[PDB]
Design an enzyme around this catalytic site. Structure first.
Site, PDB file in Angstrom:
ATOM      1  N   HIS A   1      -7.590   6.365  10.065  1.00 33.92           N
ATOM      2  CA  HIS A   1      -6.471   5.600   9.477  1.00 33.92           C
ATOM      3  C   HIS A   1      -7.001   4.819   8.288  1.00 33.92           C
ATOM      4  O   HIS A   1      -7.495   3.691   8.450  1.00 33.92           O
ATOM      5  CB  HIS A   1      -5.789   4.730  10.522  1.00 33.92           C
ATOM      6  CG  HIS A   1      -4.556   4.127   9.961  1.00 33.92           C
ATOM      7  ND1 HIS A   1      -3.817   3.186  10.633  1.00 33.92           N
ATOM      8  CD2 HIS A   1      -3.976   4.293   8.761  1.00 33.92           C
ATOM      9  CE1 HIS A   1      -2.811   2.814   9.867  1.00 33.92           C
ATOM     10  NE2 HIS A   1      -2.875   3.492   8.718  1.00 33.92           N
TER      11      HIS A   1
ATOM     12  N   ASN B   1       0.865  -1.205   0.000  1.00 31.65           N
ATOM     13  CA  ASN B   1       0.000   0.000   0.000  1.00 31.65           C
ATOM     14  C   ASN B   1       0.882   1.228   0.000  1.00 31.65           C
ATOM     15  O   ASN B   1       0.385   2.352   0.281  1.00 31.65           O
ATOM     16  CB  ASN B   1      -1.012  -0.024   1.147  1.00 31.65           C
ATOM     17  CG  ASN B   1      -0.352  -0.182   2.496  1.00 31.65           C
ATOM     18  OD1 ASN B   1       0.844   0.026   2.627  1.00 31.65           O
ATOM     19  ND2 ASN B   1      -1.138  -0.514   3.507  1.00 31.65           N
TER      20      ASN B   1
ATOM     21  N   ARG C   1       3.159   7.034  11.592  1.00 34.53           N
ATOM     22  CA  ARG C   1       2.487   6.567  12.847  1.00 34.53           C
ATOM     23  C   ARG C   1       2.237   7.758  13.753  1.00 34.53           C
ATOM     24  O   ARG C   1       3.075   8.658  13.856  1.00 34.53           O
ATOM     25  CB  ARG C   1       3.326   5.520  13.577  1.00 34.53           C
ATOM     26  CG  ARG C   1       3.409   4.165  12.884  1.00 34.53           C
ATOM     27  CD  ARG C   1       2.062   3.506  12.884  1.00 34.53           C
ATOM     28  NE  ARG C   1       1.975   2.170  12.301  1.00 34.53           N
ATOM     29  CZ  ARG C   1       1.475   1.869  11.113  1.00 34.53           C
ATOM     30  NH1 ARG C   1       1.132   2.792  10.208  1.00 34.53           N
ATOM     31  NH2 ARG C   1       1.367   0.603  10.777  1.00 34.53           N
TER      32      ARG C   1
ATOM     33  N   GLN D   1      -5.166   3.570  18.313  1.00 31.41           N
ATOM     34  CA  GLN D   1      -6.278   3.447  17.361  1.00 31.41           C
ATOM     35  C   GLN D   1      -7.215   2.354  17.819  1.00 31.41           C
ATOM     36  O   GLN D   1      -6.719   1.295  18.180  1.00 31.41           O
ATOM     37  CB  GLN D   1      -5.775   3.213  15.932  1.00 31.41           C
ATOM     38  CG  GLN D   1      -5.090   4.450  15.386  1.00 31.41           C
ATOM     39  CD  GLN D   1      -4.548   4.327  13.982  1.00 31.41           C
ATOM     40  OE1 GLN D   1      -4.026   5.291  13.446  1.00 31.41           O
ATOM     41  NE2 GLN D   1      -4.633   3.149  13.392  1.00 31.41           N
TER      42      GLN D   1
END
Ligand SMILES: NC(=O)C1=CN([C@@H]2O[C@H](COP(=O)(O)OP(=O)(O)OC[C@H]3O[C@@H](n4cnc5c(N)ncnc54)[C@H](O)[C@@H]3O)[C@@H](O)[C@H]2O)C=CC1
Ligand SMILES: NC(=O)C1=CN([C@@H]2O[C@H](COP(=O)(O)OP(=O)(O)OC[C@H]3O[C@@H](n4cnc5c(N)ncnc54)[C@H](O)[C@@H]3O)[C@@H](O)[C@H]2O)C=CC1
Lengths: 372, 375
Positions: A316, A124, A263, A292
């Site tokens: 996210h 990704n 992050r 998260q």
């Protein structure tokens, strides 16, 4: 000889009705990365949950006898030292995506003879690089407050043009020039930035520096002082946790723009919010948070610059675009097949820790790294 | 020696910057800062009247245009020079656009006014700014940014809700309507994103060398191009043949779930047809910065229209060409054009002229016979 009757636990996000409507949401508890029939036909078992945070969570119960644990950064099952000490059968921890910092990797190296922690390297990285360039432009061009003015029925060009700049002629620096950082620079090339800079202890080749048209800066503070825009593209490890604190942010130019798709824990959230509040940063954006899910009262949900703009935060999501999910779902199957086949024929670049040692150079400059 | 023109009345119609234009002096294109022109004009013995009051019956614009020799307009707050107004502009010789796109002037009427007035604009001044805005808007739509940001500000968290309409630009086909200064710069910025193909439709093509440098393909028929694209960006001027071009029939040739970006002019699309296409999910998204008319009425349908998932709107006010970096360049360009006229040289850059001496001076406002390109 193939391994037999392996217990696989997957911690994925809950897609609710969305994951029934949109089958391309592979990385959900509904669709299970398209793994269930493939595992069950081999005699393996799969348990899938999104319940991973509370005391006595499904995750906490199931991790005690899972041999393989699949996590995903967008809804991360935190594999703490305490949990790994209870995961008596765990041999393989697979990240459905990229970034395995939600695993205590030092503890993983001392667990059950040293567990394998693998992720889908490259799956990704384009998705994130696009997201970075989008976020840079949204902040530089003051899109968010401008769009809010339109939806509110208002019209005042000067109100939003007064903080609207072009990216042309600006200096952009990346912290990290790995798969994402390099791809960010490759997308910025056509925008005629004044300079493209990077900071990384793993440099680009001279040929890539010339092809892209970028310059290595040897000292992070010296790079920050030259940039209009800074983008963070390094992993979270001990030396990057809280790296972007008030002292380091103070080295950025007044009115600069900071992007973080790496992050959340690499920045100190209260320091970012304060820098925005006083106008030291013009903007902050990106998609990553710590922890998260981001708490509902997280300060970077609503922090603004003094003009009421400068916030381009999203959940996210950049690495879980529909195009990305097809790639990381296929990559998780490939990693699982390496283990379940008994070959253990992993792609070396997929390994973070393996056989009791770090298997990457990207989680800090280490001695005792064993590249397989 | 050529004799300078004397005691020229200059009228400027610019947006009102209020307190912003005092706080931020880089807001040059405002009634406050007057493109930095006032001292420069007054020192030559010229006069300058500046207003933002341009729409109502008996506006300052309507009163002052009757004896202005030069009228400066700006597309972000356009003084519409209708056939009715031009017929009353008895002294008008030069109409300068502070920016790019002179469609707020009736150019056919300009050609029949006072022996044919000069209409000039600052060609190239903000083309980079707009091309950046296009690529930003394409990414915001494709990656579903707006509803995702709204979810965060509201205190919510649901990754699936917004990832379900989140795509990558990589592997998508992008087409531009127009491959002039903006369209070409759009394609140059898209090159690094590894789109499946980059397409364009324009009766003025790129050279074969530039096609291969950028990596793009000319499509001969507009509908043929639209049917191949995932993303369409409009980058042509507003003229008779592009007004209402993007109507229900043409939008129906785009792919279901496509993304449409318009930084060109609002009147190139039929706003009700865009809204209906978005609302039925034929378009996944629409965005850009241009509206008809401007200022956009408070109830304009494209302020609030959404796709069926509650996203797909990336509209902003008319701002891309008036970034702080753009304003420095078009302010300097307006001064250069004014100096060509006021000096009596009339030594305009040919590329700045839209109409001149009773004829179109550009090929970009439709395929015409009776075009006289200076030089
Ligand atoms: N937002 C999202 O959805 C996603 C975020 N990520 C995050 O981005 C990170 C980077 O991904 P890739 O570029 O694919 O990894 P990569 O391993 O190809 O590159 C990371 C680079 O960071 C460098 N680095 C490490 N510490 C550094 C420091 N202190 N200063 C400067 N550079 C340093 C490494 O030397 C390496 O070259 C991941 O580890 C993950 O945390 C990745 C994918 C998805
Ligand atoms: N949003 C903003 O702030 C701004 C918007 N604009 C708008 O963008 C327009 C284009 O600007 P530039 O690229 O600088 O102009 P340009 O003159 O360099 O290029 C325009 C191109 O459009 C082509 N064209 C005309 N009719 C067409 C049709 N039916 N189909 C396809 N192509 C057609 C022309 O042949 C020409 O190559 C301006 O005329 C203005 O309306 C420009 C600057 C600022």
């Amino acid at each position: 000889a193939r391994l037999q009757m392996v217990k696989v636990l997957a911690v994925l996000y809950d897609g609710g009705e969305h994951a029934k409507q949109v089958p391309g949401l592979l990385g959900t508890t509904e669709n299970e990365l398209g793994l269930r029939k493939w595992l069950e036909d081999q005699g393996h078992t799969l348990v899938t949950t999104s319940d991973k945070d509370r005391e006595g969570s499904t995750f906490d119960r199931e991790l005690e006898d899972a041999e393989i644990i699949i996590t995903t950064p967008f809804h991360p099952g935190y594999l703490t030292a305490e949990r790994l000490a209870r995961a008596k059968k765990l041999k393989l921890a697979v990240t459905a995506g990229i970034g395995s910092d939600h695993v205590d990797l030092d503890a993983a190296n001392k667990t059950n003879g040293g567990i394998t922690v693998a992720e889908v390297t490259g799956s990704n990285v384009v998705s994130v690089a696009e997201h970075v360039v989008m976020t840079i432009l949204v902040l530089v061009r003051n899109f968010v407050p401008a769009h809010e003015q339109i939806e509110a029925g208002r019209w005042d060009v000067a109100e939003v043009a007064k903080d609207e700049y072009d990216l042309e002629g600006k200096v952009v620096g990346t912290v990290g020039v790995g798969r994402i950082g390099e791809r960010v620079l490759r997308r910025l090339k056509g925008f005629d930035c004044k300079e493209l800079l990077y900071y990384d202890y793993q440099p680009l080749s001279p040929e890539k520096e010339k092809e892209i048209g970028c310059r290595r800066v040897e000292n992070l503070e010296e790079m920050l002082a030259q940039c209009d825009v800074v983008t963070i593209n390094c992993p979270l490890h001990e030396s990057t946790r809280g790296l972007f604190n008030k002292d380091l942010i103070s080295k950025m130019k007044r009115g600069s723009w900071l992007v973080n798709t790496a992050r959340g824990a690499i920045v100190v959230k209260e320091d970012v919010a304060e820098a925005l509040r006083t106008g030291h940063l013009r903007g902050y954006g990106g998609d990553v948070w710590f922890p998260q899910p981001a708490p509902a009262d997280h300060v970077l949900r609503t922090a603004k610059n003094p003009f009421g703009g400068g916030n381009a935060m999203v959940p996210h999501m950049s690495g879980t675009s529909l195009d990305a999910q097809k790639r990381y779902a296929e990559g998780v199957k490939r990693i699982l097949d390496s283990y379940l086949s008994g070959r253990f024929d992993y792609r070396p670049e997929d390994l973070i820790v393996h056989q009791g040692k770090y298997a990457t150079r990207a989680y800090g400059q280490r001695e005792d790294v064993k590249i397989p």
